[model samples]
Target chain A: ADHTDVLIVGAGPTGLFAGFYVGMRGLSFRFVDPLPEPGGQLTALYPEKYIYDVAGFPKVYAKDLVKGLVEQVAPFNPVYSLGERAETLEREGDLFKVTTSQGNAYTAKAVIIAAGVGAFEPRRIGAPGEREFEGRGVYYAVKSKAEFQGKRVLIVGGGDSAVDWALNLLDTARRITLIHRRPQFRAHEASVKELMKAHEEGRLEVLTPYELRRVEGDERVRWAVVFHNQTQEELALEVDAVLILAGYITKLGPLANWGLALEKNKIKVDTTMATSIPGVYACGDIVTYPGKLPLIVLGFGEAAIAANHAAAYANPALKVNPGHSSEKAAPGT
Target chain B: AADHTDVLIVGAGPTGLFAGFYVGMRGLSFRFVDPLPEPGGQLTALYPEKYIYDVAGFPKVYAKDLVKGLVEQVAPFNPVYSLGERAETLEREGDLFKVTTSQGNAYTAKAVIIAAGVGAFEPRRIGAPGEREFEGRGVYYAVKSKAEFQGKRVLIVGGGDSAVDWALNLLDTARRITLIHRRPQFRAHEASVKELMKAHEEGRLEVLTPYELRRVEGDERVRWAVVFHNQTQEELALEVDAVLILAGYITKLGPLANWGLALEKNKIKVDTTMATSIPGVYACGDIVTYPGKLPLIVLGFGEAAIAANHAAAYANPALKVNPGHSSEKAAPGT
Candidate 1:
């Protein structure tokens, strides 16, 4: 039987860190993430982007942040079930039984739902030939920058992801043409300024108030047709890749049916990060509390609280506070 | 004239650094007051060279470098630093709180957040022979530099993380490392103990348990130390260049006790919002206590975030306590 002291329902940044604290408190945990890998949105959406606000880091790449979190808990030896979605949650006596999409089941005395945004899928651009070249030349995420090396790339969107990739691929790609449907960018104002600066210096081409019309290619994407948002005049361009960074559509999925108290799409929690369920807890972007800021840094803090509380919940003898780490030695020495 | 700001931070440690960031994020300004010349509280003051293993997102980080990163994180906020001075007095004038420093500089703010960790602290000492005589010359309580132990016979006394960590750290640089603990059991992490025992078995370092320091004798610097088994009464004398005692620390609340705030065992008691008993006053880090509170750096950071946001909202009624996602906000300006 797949059994653990704590069954983490997400392998995102919060869940990974929760595993670390759970292990530090002398508990066993297993992570279940729908994504093929850990790190949640950081891995699936923007691994190459630089995060500037995490505590103790002036600037760190998203992938590197994921790597550091993974390494931090490596000593605990967490078991992970990647690419598996938690399909159902049922109570078996005092323990929780979570069945995954892969027909695998896990049992745990406590569960921490760190499933950020639940199940998410990128919103399609809905242009002609976009579906035909989904993976051939079109990508919704940038897993690696080397994939765009010296290649002419076409990016479409107006959010942080679009603008961030525009600046990121400036030197990597041979020519970058970013077409946004609106004149005003939805990204951070500073990044928009930087993007406009790059546009002024002729580093990359920025076309505002334009929308992608169609994509044309033989074997792969070789050309893209973009039309002005107001005029509807088409402008064709030669490109090797078409990237749609239009963001994602997330669903709370079966988690909503689990009977946990929800405020809109997030799970309502207390100061201790406990959900309405007796043996279940939640944190990160998935949980909402008073004065909760949905930053990754805060998510990590919430993860620590949930992990500690979950540890104490699973085992009555364990204390909720783990005390100063300097003086306390981890169990199983 | 007293300088006015949105918040007056009472420590420049990691918690204070992040508090500055959150306050700045809410379009507020803040200043820091501390007795030390620089930031990082005890991390910078006591264990700069030691590696901290528990901070999230970092597998292991040196105390000084972590402090460096925290200082850099708050630089964009442009917090005013009142260093080498302690906050001696706290007074309320109408809605504003005024803090006067030991150097006689009074700063006024809409709110105050006390982050002074254990106020003032000192390392606990072992009354071994010649320890006081060779204090700075060869006996060290905290490591300022690993270079001092390079290629020298070092004797470490204690059984905690600090002692075990330094013993492992000096394994490569020191010519010989002799770790003497009064008890057979090491009060350190399991993995660290395993590594220490492995090193002891491999002859890389000598581990003597149930041993006590008999005496330390030297001329200009430490030249030799005599240790004995406590139960067996067997003694051995060995040549050493340095002796490091890392028993623990003795902390006092100092001037913070004079403030009329609620305290539980010398720690400021706060609600879930991290607000102290006094209105417009908040506290975080090891200085603050709440239910299920753990005195760790990561939790301190969370408490700072809560305190800063609450303090900001208190300073400005229009500002919401929750400053939304970081991605939605612009990068901190220069």
Candidate 2:
């Protein structure tokens, strides 16, 4: 276990912004997240999507926004232990020992829990016992297209997972069919563009407003029973494998055990952004108040206030207001 | 005078403008009221030409230009503006806030966000005899444009980001540049202070520490000025055409004092949501007081978002306070 002045949970845009302010407040902090990369939801779900109302810029791509925030906060020299979810908060001596799911421990004087909507699991295609063919014809993730040689593959769901899998299965699959519940793909902009291109090239066929009626076949599964939800039409597609790539079922997960007051699955925070426990603060989407807006711009303000208060709590000498970030310590774009 | 909107925003500074845009994004209508004739508030009045370094996304932008950009950003919202007016009276009537401006203009909104930044401001003048006489000849509270000092030697007074930046930008145009501050240490960015020191070492600029502007000795336009070096107790003659007094600004609560929000030294008290004592009235920017409130424009912008979102909820309790991402705005907020 290593000691830090501030231990930040969640490496999303909100957490990243908090790290930036922690440095300005002269606190040495480290970031911990379950995601391999820092950007959190931005990186995980929609790196290619356009994000608006972030205050400064008129419009910015999600990936670009993450890049800018990372660059701006780089001066802080924040240490990171990615792919680790904070599981337990134990008070040890004068500081708090916040251990991750991997048994890795980080002791800090102050803690900020920005763990965004918490651990989210992929929402399956709603087919019961679909996992029965986990290693066989039914798969959630794809390794490569070589295995799908000369086979018909049916891509389920409308989100990025479904769209991207279509690309992977296209090269080797003799034919690709994607079924979705709506005409509009749940995937972000760029992915849909690539999906459209592949569709035009006759590499894939798309069925709109469709859903998986049921996984039908023998033990190996050779067919996908697809039904158009709106049209009440049923179509059978011969498939060697069914790839289910629906969205994730988001949950607060291990965060529920941290012993903080929660309201409607959100961590309750007072005006100061502190949780039920002292020195443990929350911000961003993870925080809930009388009137909390899950907006990125408004979250930026919460992150600022949370970091300032965290810094002050870390050191008795520090004040809640660390002065204007514009002048002291000089920053980048 | 009969203004009606979903959100009535007070103070048309950077924060207030951002709020207008946010309201527009949520499909809520808004109008902005400011005591000044324009929207920029203090930035437009006192430090229009100063460069701002803290705002994210942009490397650097002049104060006036930033204001202009914010104005353009909110234009699509088609924000109703009550310029050259003041929100003198505020009262709640059946779930709506009715604000009457000093121009006798009246506005009604479901909720109100007071972004008035510490009220109106006036530049802190150079405290020296005959300083008032040079207001037109050499002294200027703010830089109207870069062309005013293209071929002239200039002297900028102050140690903040404004003084150092004006020196940096005007270096290419001004015949010569000099910066004077009462203290040796500067209040601007370290990068700027380092640039000034480099310029001083290379004979490109002059920085006077422990010095003060004494008086001006010029004709119709400034030809020379006198300075006092406190360290050496020496008199210095500064030949210049312009004296930019960026010493600082003195702020007053103005009409905001009469608005009846709880005040800490004339600043409205706000909670984390930037809400004032009044149910439907919220406040942000420098005009609002809280523990450890910042004066930076970027922070002010963030606060405005919170205030705007909170106002949205106060008006329509059914609306989700935590708005979704811009792309999934129609989606049920998680």
Candidate 3:
């Protein structure tokens, strides 16, 4: 059992910053995340992409942004319980009790639900034995750029991730083959243009309106075969690595039953980011309001509102406004 | 004959710079103007060295880094900036508006985003009867120098964090401090309030709450202050050498009001899309008002995205401004 002044339900940027804030306020916090890592979307998807709107950065890689976010909250030495999904929440007087899927219990005065797109999983290619070969030669995401170096990579999907990975590995890999079910891509037009330009330059191959027939390899992936669904034509491609970028699905799990108002799959919070449930708050991409922008920087600001208000609600002794830490003194001074 | 651009941004601060980035994403041409030569309006003007903690993703960002990042976002657009120029006049010219600066440079643009953050603010004054006479003698809105209050009895009035913070900061320089507030409770941080209470206990500070400043009596830099207690109906006099009125500041719209947009308080009222009452005109940053508005850098950046996209659509209704992910856009020169 864990005890805290504030219980953070997500270990994303919002949750991590909330820990930093209430920690500065000198409140105890316990963070629970289903993912083993702290970063939510950045770590989960598109860690290699360049982000330009984080306010303090012009073009920061998504993974580097997460690295900076971790450093930001490093001052407080936040306490977190990763890989344990929050399962249940119960309110008793002013304190709320939350229990994770692992049966670890926590008692906190207030709760902040920053569970951005809670418990998301990448959609598989639905090919047989796909689960067995997930980590062998079949990869869902490019965890590292080093894995594709000097290798023949076969990427499947037509989304931004598919096109983005194709672009990112254009020079990183020896040869690349991008297979999609349609000639049109859901990615940005500029990226699609760039990918086609690379194809014209002979660095990449584009197979449109193709369907993956099966994966053939011995213990490790050595080749893949795809075919045109209409023309019934098959193409055998030699590949060292197969990356599936079919996209991910958000699973709210027990969060859907938390009694907070939800729009679509996103939680609905007030202007103050207060949830329908008392002593509870929500923020980040998982939340929706009248005019909510699902941007990382915007999520950080929403965390500010929730963190300060959690301080106030958790302990009325604290001011509703954190009182401008910038105005008070230099952090160390 | 001033200038021509698709978008005319009236402020070159963080919000305006972000608007420029998104406007560039929409392939819109824009020109930005500000009273300051460089960008970062309030952030650069005051507290450039101070660490800004509220901007999203950055747990703590020096105002200088924040300014640098903004300048970087503005760089790709090759933004046309009219530095040291104050926009003074606005005239609607069909779909475009002609904005004339005080320097007499005119800019004709298809759309206008008013991000003039709290255009020219002034400190709220002390309204005591003898305040005019005691302007230089005893009344002071801001402390010019810490040495000015050395060994002097200071009476600070206000209930916000600024008043409490000034009282705490002046504890060492001032011989004694008596804080006067009309309400019994303070709107300051819990920590600062505790420090103030402890200072009062140590005889270093005297807190007079549920009381207000009545008047001041002094003859040529003299020192007498009268305060009335509301609950007790009792008045007291204190011999104070200096008075610090740390009430707050008020925002003035300046020439922005001339644009004929609807105003709420001192801010231009904006819709969810950040559009103003006038067609092809919108607002963002501290200069905008809507339900549940927060004066934060990150919030202002979000507003910048919304207002810039709205301004773009207002100019060319065919432009799709969803702007998915910043990274999904062409990865720079790669």
Q: What interface RMSD does each of the candidate structures achieve?
A: 2.5, 3.7, 2.5
Across A17-75, the per-residue lDDT of candidate 3 in tens digits comes to: 76777776768888888777788888777776788766657689888888877777776
Write model 2 residue lDDT over B232-332, tens digit each, in one string.
87989888888888786665667778777788887889877778988888888888876546676766887888888778777777776666678655321
Q: Can you write out model 3's per-residue Cα lDDT over B149-259, one digit (the tens) per residue?
A: 999998888887568788999987999899999897776656778999898998888998898888888988748888899789799999999888777655466888777
Candidate 1 is scored at a TM of 0.67
Q: What is the lDDT of residue B297 in candidate 3?
A: 76
Q: What's the lDDT of the predicted structure labeled candidate 1?
A: 0.86
Residue-level lDDT of model 1, residues B240-298, one tens digit each, is 99988877555567789999999999999988788899999999888987665677788
* Model 1 chain A: worst 10 consecutive residues (lDDT sum): A324-333
Per DockQ, what order, best first? 3, 2, 1
Residue pairs with backbone atoms closer than 3 Å in model 3 (clashes) = B2-B106
Backbone clashes per model, in order? 0, 6, 1
Query: Which is the leading candidate under DockQ?
Result: 3
TM-score of predicted structure 2: 0.70
Positional deviation of A283 in candidate 1, in angstroms? 1.4
